[PDB]
Amino acid sequence: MGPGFDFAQAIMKKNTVIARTEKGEFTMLGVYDRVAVIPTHASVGEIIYINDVETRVLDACALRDLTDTNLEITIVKLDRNQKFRDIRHFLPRCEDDYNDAVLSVHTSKFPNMYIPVGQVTNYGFLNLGGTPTHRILMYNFPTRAGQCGGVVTTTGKVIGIHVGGNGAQGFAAMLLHSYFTD
């Protein structure tokens, strides 16, 4: 409908796959080469389904900050025959607040879904499903089950992946450029 949705659509069309684990179907953001991200509660194992194709996991790392607190991001390297478009230059370098964000989801249940969520707060600490979690972004939109792994964007930036909600608010884990230095 406008330039926010335009940027969101460009990321969804080239940099997402549908990931399936024993814990469900998730939107998965490809970042560069064969490296992607997914919420840690997806419980990635040695094998994952990517667009319904059986795929070996070459590496998976559940990120924690330097205080050994959960960040809810798992970085996965996939034994896939094709690289993602490199989108690391769209990642923010520091923790920040944002205006006018879009949450975009692509699953069997919610295809081609875009949600304008408005203002995004640097919320910080969240008790997420009983797990102390840091670097949480918050938006005042009643996001529901199935939208986990959803990409949060602004015009020109990919800022986070959806990891939960409380029925009134939705929460995303920050993506930072420093996670994907190779």
Side-chain angles (χ1 to χ4, degrees), residues 35-81:
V35 176
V37 292
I38 192 171
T40 296
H41 71 252
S43 299
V44 178
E46 295 303 304
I47 300 172
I48 193 168
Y49 271 47
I50 303 294
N51 297 337
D52 288 318
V53 182
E54 188 187 3
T55 302
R56 291 190 292 266
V57 171
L58 298 171
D59 187 61
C61 172
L63 298 185
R64 300 184 74 88
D65 74 12
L66 291 186
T67 70
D68 192 27
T69 308
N70 182 43
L71 294 166
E72 204 47 27
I73 300 288
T74 292
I75 306 180
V76 182
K77 189 164 173 183
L78 300 170
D79 197 2
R80 193 149 179 262
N81 72 354

Side-chain angles (χ1 to χ4, degrees), residues 103 117 119-121 123 126 136-144 147 152 161-173:
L103 171 60
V117 292
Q119 273 194 24
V120 177
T121 302
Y123 192 82
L126 185 64
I136 293 293
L137 294 166
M138 181 272 283
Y139 27 93
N140 283 294
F141 190 89
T143 40
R144 316 176 156 175
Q147 293 184 155
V152 186
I161 61 165
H162 185 75
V163 296
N166 60 24
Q169 297 171 324
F171 299 103

Side-chain angles (χ1 to χ4, degrees), residues 20-43:
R20 174 176 289 278
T21 73
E22 292 178 330
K23 312 278 154 107
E25 218 181 55
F26 295 87
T27 303
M28 169 177 267
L29 176 75
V31 177
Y32 73 106
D33 296 352
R34 294 167 288 173
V35 176
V37 292
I38 192 171
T40 296
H41 71 252
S43 299

Side-chain angles (χ1 to χ4, degrees), residues 151-181:
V151 188
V152 186
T153 57
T154 64
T155 55
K157 295 194 247 60
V158 181
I159 70 168
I161 61 165
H162 185 75
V163 296
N166 60 24
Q169 297 171 324
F171 299 103
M174 286 178 190
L175 294 167
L176 298 179
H177 184 95
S178 53
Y179 296 163
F180 303 102
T181 68

Side-chain angles (χ1 to χ4, degrees), residues 18-20 24-27 52 105-114 143-148:
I18 304 181
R20 174 176 289 278
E25 218 181 55
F26 295 87
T27 303
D52 288 318
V105 170
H106 188 82
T107 67
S108 297
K109 177 186 194 166
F110 293 141
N112 298 294
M113 162 181 292
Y114 304 79
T143 40
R144 316 176 156 175
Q147 293 184 155
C148 297

